[PDB]
């Protein structure tokens, strides 16, 4: 699987998604990023409750590589690694489109 962390949230249950790939921490593009993706990230982090996506660098932009461009998740996966990659685009993503989550979303 992939190491994952949430950064720049108000608490440890939310923030911009960073993933560790090819020796570096980097971000995930929000193209196609929905609540199903958020469920999977939050599940991998050990949270069990409802999750919600946050798009367009909601918590702030990341820096360094954008590791993944178009992740396809059913929403049921236990880990980001089990989602499937897609060649749906020429990959023009910028850090202004960095994806995020809120885990155990309340109200």
Curated annotation (Swiss-Prot):
Disulfide bonds: 29-93, 42-103, 73-83
Residue span(s) of domain SRCR: 4-105
Expressed in which tissues: Most abundant in cerebral cortex, hippocampus and amygdala.
Location in or out of the cell: Secreted
Family of the protein in this entry: Belongs to the peptidase S1 family.
Function of the protein: Plays a role in neuronal plasticity and the proteolytic action may subserve structural reorganizations associated with learning and memory operations.
Name used for this protein in its record: Neurotrypsin
Source organism: Mus musculus (Mouse)
Gene assigned in the entry: Prss12
Entire protein: shown range: 383 to 489 of 761
